[PDB]
Design a protein around this ligand. Structure first.
Ligand SMILES: *[C@@H]1O[C@H](CO)[C@@H](O[C@@H]2O[C@H](CO)[C@@H](O)[C@H](O)[C@H]2NC(C)=O)[C@H](O)[C@H]1NC(C)=O
Ligand SMILES: *[C@@H]1O[C@H](CO)[C@@H](O[C@@H]2O[C@H](CO)[C@@H](O)[C@H](O)[C@H]2NC(C)=O)[C@H](O)[C@H]1NC(C)=O
Ligand SMILES: [Cl-]
Ligand SMILES: [Cl-]
Ligand code: NA
Lengths: 328, 340
C-alpha cells in the first residue's frame, strides 16, 4: 500500500526516467514480440500486471540481465517459454499469481539462485517443486491443484492453503515460521517434526481424525495452532492461540498448566461434555457453544476463567450463562 | 479498453510518452491515499493512468495541477463518490474511465467544465443516478452493470451501452446520431421512446419485460439492421406496415409468442430470424432466397404450416431441431408438429 505524494511520485518518476523501472501494468497488452525488450538492458524492475497476456514468446527476457523484480500477475498465461529465466540470475521476486498456469517444470528456477519471494497463487498448478529453490524466503502457492507439497530448506513463510495436498515432503527446515495449509486433504501430521521453528500453523479444513502430541515435541516457538473443521474425536495433551472448533471432539484433556499462556481458545461446535481450565489470568477469548455440557463442569469453568452463546437447547438441556447444559 | 501488441515500435512510442511525462502510468502500484498536491511538480501530464489500485477517495482539488489532462483512467479502484469540483479545472478531458469502482451517484455538476468529454466509461459500479443528457459532447458511453432506473440519453451519443441495469424509463432529446443501443437485461415495458432515435442500426432489448411491440414505433427508422428482443414476455406480434428494408436480423426467441402476423413481403429481406422457444402454431414466409439462418424449435407447430414453411425456405436455412416431441406431435424435418 503506497501513499502518492510529491515525494513518492518524484522517486517513481526518477526510476522511470532512467528506464530502471518499467511500468506496463494495466495497458491491455495481449501479445508480446520476442524482441520487445531487445534494447532494454537497463531494466531492473518490470511490471506487466493486470494485462491480458496469453503467451510469453521465446527469449522474451534474453536481454534484461539486471532484472530483479518481475510482476506478471493477473494475466492469461498457461505455460512458460523454454529457458524463460536462463538469463535473469539477479531475480529476487517474481509474481505470476492469477494466471492459468498448470505446471512449473523443474528447470524453471535453476538459474535464479537469489529468488526469495515467489508468488504463484490462484493458478491451476498440479506440479511445482519448491524444494529445488533453496533461496526461497516467502512463498505463496495457495489456490492451486497441488497434491504434493515439497518444502525448501529455508523458507520462512509458506502459504499453500486451498489445494488438495495430502503429502508434505522436504528437508528439515528450522526457519519455517508461518505455515498456512488450511483447506487441503491432510490426514497425517508426522511431517511437523521437520519444522521445529514453527510459530503459526493452520491445518484447518483438512481430513485429520487424530492429532498425536508427539509430533509437536521438537517445537521451540509454537504460538498459534489452528485445526478447526477437521474430524478430531479426542485430544489428550509457548502456546497462545488454539482453535479446535468444528470438530467431533468428545473430550480434551491437558495435564495441566500448558494451557496457562493461552489467550484464545475455541472449542465451539464439538461434542464436549466436561472441560477443566485453571484460573488463567488472562485468557482473552473462549468459545464454548454447540457442545454437550454437563452443568457442574460448565459452572466451575466460569468461576476460574466468553464470546459466544447457545440459542436453542435440546431436551434435558437448559441455558446457564447463555450456554446449554444438562444436570446430574 | 482495446488490447495492444507490445512490439519494439509500440514500446518505443510508450517510452517516448513516458520520457516527456506526458503519459503517466501509475496503474497497479497499490496506491491507496493520494495527497491533494501529488501532481504539483507534474504539470505536463495529458494522460493519467491510475487503474488497478486501491484508491478510496480523491481530494477535490487533486487535478488542479494537471490542467492539460485529456485522458483519465481510474478503473478498478474503491471510489464510492466524486467530490464537488473534481473536474472543474480539467476542461480538455476527452476520455474518463472509472469502471469497476463502487460509485453510487454522479452529481449533475460533475461534468460542467468538461465540454469536450466524448468517451465515458462507468460500467460495474452501483450507480443509481447519472444524468448523461447534461453532457452533449458524449459520443461513446458505457453505464452497464449499475442500478439505474431512468436513462437520460444525450443529444448526440453514437453508441450507448446501458445493459444490466433496472431501467424502466428512457428520456432525452431527439438524437439522430445514435447508432448502437444496448439495453439488454433491464426492466423496459414500452418502446415509444424509439421514435426519438431514427438513426439506430443495432438495438438490443433482450431480457426486458416487453409484452407487446408496437410496430408504429419503428416508422422513423431509416437504417435499422438488427433488432434483438429475445427473453421478453411477448405473446402476439402484428407487423403490418411498410417493411424496414435495411432490417436483416430479428431475434424473437424465448418469448411466449402464439403468432407473428405480417404482410406477405414483410420479412423478404431478413437474413437471420430466430423464433425458437415460443408457442407458435402457424407462421408464414414468402419464397425469399435472402434467409441464411431460421430457428423454429421448441414451438407448437401445425404440420401443414410447418411443411408450407419448408416449401418456401431453402433447405439449409433451418439451423435447429427438436429432439423429442410431446404426445401427438412427431418430427418433420427435425421439428415437432401435430397433424390436423
Ligand atoms: C496468498 O495468496 C492468497 C490469494 O491471493 C491471499 O489471499 C487473499 O488475501 C487477501 C488479503 O488477506 C484477501 O482480501 C483475499 O480475499 C484473498 N484472496 C482469495 C482468493 O482468497 C493470501 O493472503 C496470501 N497469503 C499470504 C500469507 O499473504
Ligand atoms: C461496456 O462495458 C462492459 C464492461 O462490463 C463490457 O462488457 C464486457 O464485454 C467483454 C467483451 O467485449 C467481455 O469480455 C466481458 O465479460 C464483459 N464484462 C462483463 C462485466 O460482463 C461491454 O462490452 C462494454 N460495452 C461495449 C459496447 O463495448
Ligand atoms: Cl510477502
Ligand atoms: Cl465543477
Ligand atoms: Na521451522
Amino acid at each position: 500500500s503506497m501513499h502518492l505524494t510529491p515525494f513518492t511520485l518524484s522517486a517513481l518518476l526518477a526510476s522511470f526516467h532512467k528506464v530502471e523501472v518499467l511500468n506496463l501494468n494495466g495497458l491491455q497488452i495481449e501479445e508480446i514480440d520476442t524482441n520487445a525488450f531487445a534494447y532494454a538492458h537497463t531494466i531492473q524492475k518490470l511490471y506487466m500486471r493486470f494485462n491480458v497476456i496469453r503467451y510469453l514468446p521465446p527469449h522474451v527476457f534474453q536481454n534484461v540481465p539486471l532484472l530483479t523484480v518481475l510482476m506478471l500477475d493477473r494475466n492469461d498465461l498457461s505455460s512458460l517459454p523454454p529457458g524463460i529465466f536462463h538469463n535473469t540470475p539477479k531475480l529476487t521476486m517474481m509474481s505470476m499469481s492469477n494466471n492459468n498456469l498448470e505446471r512449473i517444470e523443474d528447470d524453471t528456477f535453476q538459474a535464479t539462485t537469489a529468488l526469495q519471494n515467489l508468488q504463484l497463487s490462484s493458478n491451476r498448478l498440479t506440479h511445482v517443486d519448491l524444494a529445488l529453490i533453496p533461496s526461497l524466503f516467502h512463498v505463496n502457492v495457495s489456490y492451486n491443484l497441488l497434491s504434493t507439497l515439497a518444502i525448501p530448506i529455508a523458507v520462512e513463510e509458506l502459504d499453500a492453503s486451498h489445494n488438495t495436498i495430502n503429502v508434505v515432503r522436504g528437508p528439515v527446515n528450522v526457519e519455517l515460521t508461518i505455515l498456512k495449509l488450511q483447506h487441503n486433504n491432510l490426514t497425517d501430521t508426522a511431517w511437523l517434526l521437520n519444522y521445529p521453528g514453527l510459530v503459526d500453523v493452520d491445518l484447518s479444513y483438512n481430513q485429520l481424525e487424530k492429532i498425536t502430541y508427539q509430533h509437536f515435541v521438537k517445537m521451540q516457538r509454537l504460538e498459534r495452532l489452528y485445526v478447526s473443521n477437521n474430524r478430531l474425536v479426542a485430544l489428550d495433551f509457548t502456546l497462545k492461540v488454539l482453535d479446535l472448533s468444528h470438530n467431533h471432539l468428545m473430550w480434551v484433556e491437558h495435564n495441566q498448566a500448558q494451557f496457562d499462556k493461552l489467550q484464545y481458545l475455541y472449542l465451539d461446535h464439538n461434542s464436549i461434555v466436561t472441560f477443566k481450565l485453571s484460573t488463567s489470568h488472562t485468557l482473552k477469548n473462549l468459545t464454548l457453544s454447540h457442545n454437550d455440557w454437563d452443568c457442574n463442569s460448565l459452572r466451575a469453568l466460569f468461576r476460574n476463567v466468553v464470546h459466544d452463546a447457545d440459542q436453542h437447547c435440546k431436551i434435558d438441556y437448559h441455558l446457564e450463562h447463555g450456554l446449554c447444559c444438562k444436570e446430574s
